[PDB]
C-alpha cells in the first residue's frame, strides 16, 4: 500500500500472502473518502475468521473506470486488461492518488491494452505487444491503416478532472482449501487478575473460577493440566510462562 510506483493495469502485479497476521483496520486510514467494496464477506468481520492464502493485485486505473473492476461487469478494462470471476469472494480498495501519480507535463509510464482478439478469462495476464491487424490486409508490423498498436497511455495530468484522475486499486482475494488456515488476524488480550472468581479465556479455552499461583511443574511443551476427574485444573499463561 505504500509502494512508490504501481504496475500497469495490463501487466498487473500478483502477490501471494501466507503465514502472517493481518490487521485490516489500518486500511481505513488510507483516505478520508474511498471505496471499500467487499464481496462475499462483511469487512467488519474480517478479524475473526481466517484463510489459507491471500492474493493481492495492485495497479492504477482511471477514476471513472473503477466501476468496471467487479464481477459481472463489462467494458474495456473488464475484458481486455483485468477480468474478475463471477464466483469471486474478496475485497477491492481503490483510492485517489492525484498527489503521487500526476505530472504537469504528463505521466506516460502507465499503459493499458486497447485491442485484443478476444476477451480475458478470469485472472489472466496478456503481456503481448504484437501489432493488431484490424482489417484483412496483413501489415506485418507497421502502424498504418487497420493496424493499431494495442497499448495506449493514460496521459495523467493534475489539471484533469476527478473523472480522469488516477486511482490506485488493490484487490484482495481469499479462498478455502483443505490445508490449515494460517493468515489469521490479531486476537488482542487483557491484563491478568489473580485470587478472584472471574471468567477467563485461555487460547480459546473457556472457564470460570479463581486463578491462584500453582506449584505444579509442567514439561516445557505441556499446555493444560487435568485432574483425576478429567477436568481442567492447571493452565499455562500464553504470554508469560
Amino acid at each position, epitope marked *: 500500500f505504500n509502494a*512508490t*510506483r504501481f504496475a*500497469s493495469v495490463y501487466a498487473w502485479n500478483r502477490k501471494r500472502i501466507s503465514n502472517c497476521v493481518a490487521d485490516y483496520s489500518v486500511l481505513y486510514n488510507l483516505a478520508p473518502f474511498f471505496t471499500f467494496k467487499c464481496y462475499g464477506v462483511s469487512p467488519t468481520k474480517l478479524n475473526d475468521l481466517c484463510f489459507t492464502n491471500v492474493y493481492a493485485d495492485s495497479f492504477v486505473i482511471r477514476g471513472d473506470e473503477v466501476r468496471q473492476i467487479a464481477p459481472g461487469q463489462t467494458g474495456n478494462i473488464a475484458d481486455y486488461n483485468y477480468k474478475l470471476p463471477d464466483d469471486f469472494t474478496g475485497c477491492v480498495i481503490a483510492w485517489n492518488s492525484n*498527489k*503521487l501519480d*500526476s*505530472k*504537469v*507535463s504528463g505521466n*506516460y*509510464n502507465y*499503459l493499458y491494452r486497447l485491442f485484443r482478439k478476444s476477451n480475458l478469462k478470469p485472472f489472466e495476464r496478456d503481456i503481448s*505487444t504484437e501489432i493488431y491487424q484490424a482489417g484483412n490486409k496483413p501489415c506485418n508490423g507497421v502502424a498504418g491503416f487497420n493496424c493499431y*498498436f494495442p*497499448l495506449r*497511455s493514460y496521459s495523467f495530468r493534475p489539471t484533469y478532472g476527478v473523472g480522469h484522475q488516477p486511482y490506485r486499486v488493490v484487490v484482495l482475494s481469499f479462498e478455502l482449501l483443505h490445508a490449515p488456515a494460517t493468515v489469521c488476524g490479531p486476537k488482542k488480550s487483557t491484563n491478568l487478575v489473580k485470587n478472584k472468581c472471574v471468567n477467563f479465556n485461555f487460547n480459546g479455552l473457556k472457564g470460570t473460577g479463581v486463578l491462584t499461583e500453582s506449584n505444579k511443574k509442567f514439561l516445557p511443551f505441556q499446555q493444560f493440566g487435568r485432574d483425576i476427574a478429567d477436568t481442567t485444573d492447571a493452565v499455562r499463561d500464553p504470554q508469560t510462562l
Partner: antibody
Amino acid sequence: QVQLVQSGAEVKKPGSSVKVSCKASGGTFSSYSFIWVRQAPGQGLEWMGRIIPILGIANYAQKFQGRVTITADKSTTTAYMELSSLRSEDTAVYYCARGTEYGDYDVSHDWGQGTLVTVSS
Amino acid sequence: DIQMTQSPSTLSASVGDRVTITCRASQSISSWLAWYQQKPGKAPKLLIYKASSLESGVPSRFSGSGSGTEFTLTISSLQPDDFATYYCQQYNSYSHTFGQGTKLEIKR
C-alpha cells in the same frame, strides 16, 4: 545489462546539420525511451529532447524548436538526433540516455560514452 | 520554466565522513526528482529517482529525503570513490532543467 554505443568525434564548420547515432543493445527494444543531453566543457548538463518510439511522442526543450529532431529505427534498433544551423557556442559532449517503462521514461537508467562535437572555421 | 539551485556549490569532505547536499526548486515540483554522480571525464550514472527510490546496484548508503521544493542527498560513511560532481534533475513539467553541480573534494 544494456550497452550503449555512440558515434565518433565530429568537427565541422558552423553552417551545416549534424547527425548523431545511438545504439542500444539488451532486452526488449519497444520498452525504451531515448533522451538526449548536452554537456558544455565550461558548464554542466542540459536536457534537449525525449522520444518514445513505441508511442510516437517527441518533446524538445524550449530553446531547441526548429533546430533538433530526434527519431528512431526499430529495424536497426537505434536512435538518431540531428541538429541544424550550428553556432560556435554549440560545441559540447553529447550524451544519449535510456529510460525504461519498468521505472520511468523521464529518468535516465543507462548512459552512453558521449560524442565531442566542435564547430569553428 | 522551473529554476532550481544545488547547495553548497563546493564541499570538502573526507573518507568515512557524513555529508549532505541540498537541492531546492523555485516552485513546487511534487516529488519528481533524480540524482546523478559524475566522475571527472566519465559518463553520468543514476543513483536515486523519485527522491526516495534507490537505483539497483548503487550502494544503500546513499539516501534521498524530500517532499517538494526541498530535497537532500545524504552519505553516511564516505569512501574515496565518492568524490564526484552531483547533479539534480527534476522531471515535473517539460523543459527538464539540471543543477549547478556540487563537486566534493578532500581537505588538503
